[PDB]
Write a protein that binds this ligand. Structure first.
Ligand SMILES: [Fe+3]
Length: 190
């Protein structure tokens, strides 16, 4: 549930840290998806759309997000939605993915300088979350077609955050408790 920093689901449908489902390893899905699974993915994306719309988000008390993983709505299945709106350059990320898996991990690390938040986490944890600056993901889309993404920088970070949810990993598991805000030598600020 990467935060935005640049049935209609509502915030109570998003389980909170401490819920067991967030710590489980989600199930690989067979394609084609069931109708319920498709509706789930579509509703996860619609929640991000709603959360990004200033009026709808204010009207329904939504926290703005750019990613959501199915475990966060208590569905232990490997599905994520990422919706990073146009950053001003025309680059936009609108992907509903099934069984996403990182197949190439960039050695150079990158991090958001303010750390990371998560829609499932109300009590924020300070610290840099070092991630791969570049990644390649293989996944299936909602119709079971093949998608391979090459991502870098912020979008890479967002997808890594969401994929981590499928493995029961939260952003803070990456935080070095000894030197939380110290960037790794090689690391670059996103
Ligand atoms: Fe999250």
């Amino acid at each position: 549930g990467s935060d935005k920093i640049h049935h209609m689901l509502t915030m109570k449908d998003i389980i909170r840290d401490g819920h067991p489902t967030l710590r489980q390893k989600a199930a690989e899905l067979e394609l084609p998806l069931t109708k319920e699974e498709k509706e789930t993915l579509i509703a996860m994306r619609e929640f991000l759309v709603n959360s990004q719309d200033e009026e709808i988000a204010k009207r329904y008390g939504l926290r703005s997000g750019v990613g959501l993983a199915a475990p966060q709505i208590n569905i232990s299945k490997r599905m994520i939605a990422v919706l990073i709106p146009d950053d001003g350059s025309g680059k936009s990320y609108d992907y509903m993915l099934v069984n996403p898996k990182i197949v190439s991990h960039s050695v150079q690390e990158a991090y958001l300088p303010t750390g990371e938040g998560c829609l499932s986490v109300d009590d924020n944890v300070a610290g840099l979350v070092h991630r791969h600056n570049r990644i390649t993901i293989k996944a299936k889309d909602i119709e079971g077609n093949d998608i391979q993404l090459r991502l870098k920088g912020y979008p890479a970070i967002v997808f890594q955050h969401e994929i981590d949810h499928l493995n029961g990993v939260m952003f803070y598991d990456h935080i070095d408790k000894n030197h939380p805000l110290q960037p790794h030598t090689d690391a670059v600020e996103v």
